[PDB]
């Protein structure tokens, strides 16, 4: 096929252009399987070349140029084009570190790796905070239909970036727990080591190398904390949520209790207004005292009853 | 007993027979112990033979020659005699890289088990997708009873797929881990120490091996990766339809107690219209300014006590 | 006091006496505090002895013999003293591998604990899985009262097996990670280091030691997983009975909901009903045309606002 | 200040007395950070000196002395008067295994220890598993509310009963995993390198360490699975509890269900009854084959109404 | 721009200026990248400098000084300018160990951080044990509204909380763990290797800062099990507020329908009462013994139909 190539050289240029998949590998002197970028997070050198996926950044980091492969419909315009060359180029900054190439590029990708994590992070966290506030409040019955979908989709990707972050971690522990790994990333060295070792100024050794790594497995480590407790936040505030909802709920139910206790209490003697209403001879029909004696019997006794009933619940406590 | 041999050589040939288990043993110089298969997941190398089994697929990789042993009733037809010799026979892929037959052995192996973990998670994860997605919404009361026992199988399938994944890693971190393990698995190096040696061109060394088997272990890492982000999510939409139920609960308990308190209302002033219907001397059955106001006064007195009931449950939020 | 011992020599032949435990120190070479037995799972050797416990199974393989200790009430009858002399005798499986007398006595005694722990495992999950499969299903209300004792029993009973299967894997692995540890169990290669050393032959090394403790922690690995999933497959049916009760309750609770607004519309238009029965001169009741025109309002009235009620639940979803 | 010193020579006789701390770190030949017992779980070694602390019980380990500090007020009269001299006396036991002193004093604290740890867990063991027992039982709508506080008071316990056992055990595990820390418990040895080392029976050495601080490792291993079980047990029975719960709550709601469809049946035909009750020409109160008629209609159609709303809620199973 | 620094000298006077970064990097032999505190939880050293940052708290150690920089706006004054100038001076504690300022400065360092995080649990604990305390009693149908909030932000302090003990137990384990990190704290030695050793009586090597470490990392140790032990009893505590709410709605849920059985046997026969009070010729309206025999019958049997529903539900258990 073709491979979409981004191409800095030690200077920061920017040269963008297409090549055949065989023929880049000849080029960099590579193999078909070095460039199968099939794992989405990978930080391998193959043959004094560095070789990094991280998910669509798919570069490869040569002595002296830094190639960015699959560069197109990624939005990969700004970083490449303005921010990347003036990090490559070593301009500012400190003038006394003059560090090499394949530092400043495993540097600059590290660091973008960390920013596309960082900003994830930040977008997430306050879009969680602000449904779980507003949805753990205790002044509902309910709580909001279409903000727990929200939180469905938010909760994914949140799980999806803490993956992120892990692989990330274990790409960068994986380096600098084997010191051999460590030292392939030094590929200037290997490919002059004579040249590289005139400079023996301290610019480029396994501890300038360890110090980069373990900057951003620092910073990536940072992320997985702050990752992490969104997480138990969620739960935690998921299980104010059920408690919210079971307390309503149990109270709604004691009211319509004591109202239940007030329609049984008049229907319990509504019944004798009932019975006394049929046309059948009750043989007091004439008398002009026990109308109103029914008729306070069934008022009183409806509310005795009540009272009666609502200390039974008080007595279930 | 007899094993159901297919053998391919070092060509891709495939010749296909029936051996009795005890003269098996003694033309691949192995012993009874070591064909048993009795683990579900293991790659070991006895007496110059690697002795590999995945599930179902049992093989044993020789010097010169592939078995794949109990190759019947298992679907290893379209495979076995189509795919299998394409890829043993090293047609195609680079012709600069001639490696020994173990190496195109091991790797058609591990290739194979990683497309049937591929394959039963790229099934998995549209059923469950499209089964929590749609016992997800919050627009019913309850949720479809038929697809709660899907989601059930669907779980079940996916922990069996993740201790799959799992168990191959471990198999192969195992050989990883360990030096004198992954030198073992150069059977021709062994085999001809001289003969071999003779092509000493970097065609197959600890590199090359551990390169191979690093592939498949971060391949299957991918895929735990995506199975453990998949039954995180099953239980975050559990969790949401938790809150989906026991909100629409709440609403339909303070509609019911809404309710209650209007036949409430209309129970407690019509007991005043039951007892001035009962057949007694009320003393007013003959004036006419005396059956409209008590008609009013139960229409209106319902409705005032209704809203002063709408009001207390108000008061509770 | 007395220690009932089951004596195997290195033909298989069975001998059960009983012996004080002070003699039985001296004549075993060992301590008190040896063969205390006070750790429910334990793999030791003591000064040229193998003492082993595997909760109630007691033994103690000397270079010569093999000892079962404490063997009366444990139902250690059937295997002691028909499976077991079968297998220390060496009979059939191949008669080209003359392992020591230890090899034979510490396979027998794993495969035995290996075989229990199988067996527990096999009787466990399918009452598991059968009392899970019918609690599951969405056709009731309600769950058995009765089964929710064998789930809780059962699940107890899987909890104690995981932890059996725990400690045996921990023992097996201690031997296995420490080379001192694993050259200690071959006993007759140092009570006799000249004896033992000229059949030379490949018999007992720290091979064939290495590839017997490791068949057994991969028997041992597989039931672990096999409980666990159990175990987990648990925890997934409990949450879909959950949704299962809740969306049953949300569906009686509807149709009740639907039922109250039924009865509130018929006694809100049942109230002009009352209203018009009452003994009071209402100036109406000599008219033709009122009575049915009020009938007909009643049930009208009550048709129409039912469903204007049944409207608004179809609103709140 | 002053410590409370109970003093044990290497013959168990028992001294009390009260020294300012300033002298004792003069006497011990130590300083005032080494006795600061800030940890709630140590065993340090300190210039020859076995300094531990276990929750309230801080005592120092001297080559000739064992000193327990601050025993007063915790119940330290029984064990440090009776018990612990007749241990550190060497009586009994072995009488052909003379072990220092530090080996009879270290023993006899790790058992003390253990015997609170194990003292702890069987007491309460029972009281859950007899609170949870009858909590779990289908036989009630609702759970007692006085035994609820006791599992919460109980679980409290026993989740700081399993840090009391993990500390344990990781004290433990320092020393084994440390072979200088192991050979520093040897303090009678570094005290006198030539006098102990005339008596080079094996009375101690790196294995009669080992095995006493491997056999304490192993009771606590114990005690966390055990413990350990008893938490999983209680998560497994409040799971069973809300299934209890939630079986009975669809059970009452059902019942109540069929009786709200039975009273709206009776409200629905009641209607026309209290229609026909009416004061208004109904023009037919004087037809006699009318009044038995709509009686029969009211009650017949009820039960019809009923019969086929009872059928409505078991079309939804 | 500018660092403000209060610099604390080896006599523990306090000197407050502020310089421009640029110049403290040249002042402190440093680079920009050394000083960049982007890291929560950090103890580097970088040449002969011990850098630390814990949250707020940004310190510089030098040979004979320590730094405190952003001290502003973080009421870093009480400890600042009159507890760190004591520690720092080495007057009182012990004045036979003239360790080095390095081991000064960081025990202080460490020891206001374990102090702050100290602080923040013994703060937290008492909040969480009230407010859980108080929710979970069994006496109320719901909870207090109010102060699931409360719990809500408790329990989210008490997870930053549990990250801060986390972090900063591994930023002092990343120093023991590896001797060269451990042996870099010692600053004096690197800058005087000779003046530094001619005080060769033990005043500081690898033992004492081991130690000091040691100390620290075990007291947030005992910081770790208290907050997860809190975290813990908040759980279990959530749990038996479910059963409570639970128990509770069982409780209403059994009497209201208690209540509805006895509704219904009042409708089901004040039916016949509503049908005998027709204005319908029921050829029973004259005689004198068939009114008080319905009117029993309807008392009566609202009664016994009211005693059978009563076991009905006790039937259902
Ligand atoms: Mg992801
Ligand atoms: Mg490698
Ligand atoms: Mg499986
Ligand atoms: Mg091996
Ligand atoms: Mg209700
Ligand atoms: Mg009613
Ligand atoms: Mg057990
Ligand atoms: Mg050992
Ligand atoms: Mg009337
Ligand atoms: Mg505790
Ligand atoms: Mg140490
Ligand atoms: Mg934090
Ligand atoms: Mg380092
Ligand atoms: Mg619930």
């Not at 190539?5 to 002197?29: A, I």
């Not at 199968?36 to 990978?42: A, E, I, K, L, N």
């Not at 994590?117 to 506030?133: A, N, V």
Request: charged letters at 25%.
């Amino acid at each position: 096929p073709v491979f979409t190539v981004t191409k800095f050289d030690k200077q920061g240029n920017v040269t963008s252009f297409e090549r055949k998949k065989t023929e880049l590998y000849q080029e960099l002197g590579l193999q078909a399987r070095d460039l199968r970028f099939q794992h989405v997070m990978s930080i391998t050198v193959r043959n004094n070349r560095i070789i990094m996926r991280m998910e669509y950044l798919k570069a490869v980091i040569t002595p002296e140029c830094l190639l960015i492969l699959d560069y197109r419909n990624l939005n990969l315009e700004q970083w490449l084009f303005r921010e990347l060359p003036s990090q490559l180029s070593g301009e500012g900054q400190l003038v006394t570190y003059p560090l090499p190439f394949e530092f400043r590029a495993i540097e600059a990708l590290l660091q973008y790796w960390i920013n596309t994590l960082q900003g994830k992070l930040s977008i997430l966290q306050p879009l969680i905070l602000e449904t779980l506030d507003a949805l753990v409040d205790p002044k509902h019955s309910s709580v909001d239909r279409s903000k727990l979908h929200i939180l469905l989709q938010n909760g994914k990707s949140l799980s999806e970036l803490e993956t992120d972050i892990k692989i990330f971690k274990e790409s960068i522990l994986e380096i600098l727990d084997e010191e051999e790994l460590l030292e392939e990333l030094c590929v200037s060295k290997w490919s002059d080591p004579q040249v590289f070792e005139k400079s023996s100024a301290g610019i480029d050794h396994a501890e300038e190398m360890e110090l980069l790594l373990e900057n951003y497995y620092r910073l990536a480590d940072d992320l997985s904390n702050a990752a992490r407790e969104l997480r138990v936040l969620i739960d935690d505030s998921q299980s104010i949520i059920f408690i919210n909802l079971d307390s309503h709920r149990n109270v709604m139910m004691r009211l319509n209790l004591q109202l239940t206790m007030g329609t049984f209490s008049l229907s319990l003697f509504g019944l004798m207004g009932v019975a006394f209403g049929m046309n059948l001879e009750s043989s007091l029909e004439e008398d002009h005292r026990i109308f109103w004696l029914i008729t306070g019997i069934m008022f009183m006794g409806s509310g005795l009853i009540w009272r009666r009933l609502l200390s039974f619940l008080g007595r279930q406590l």
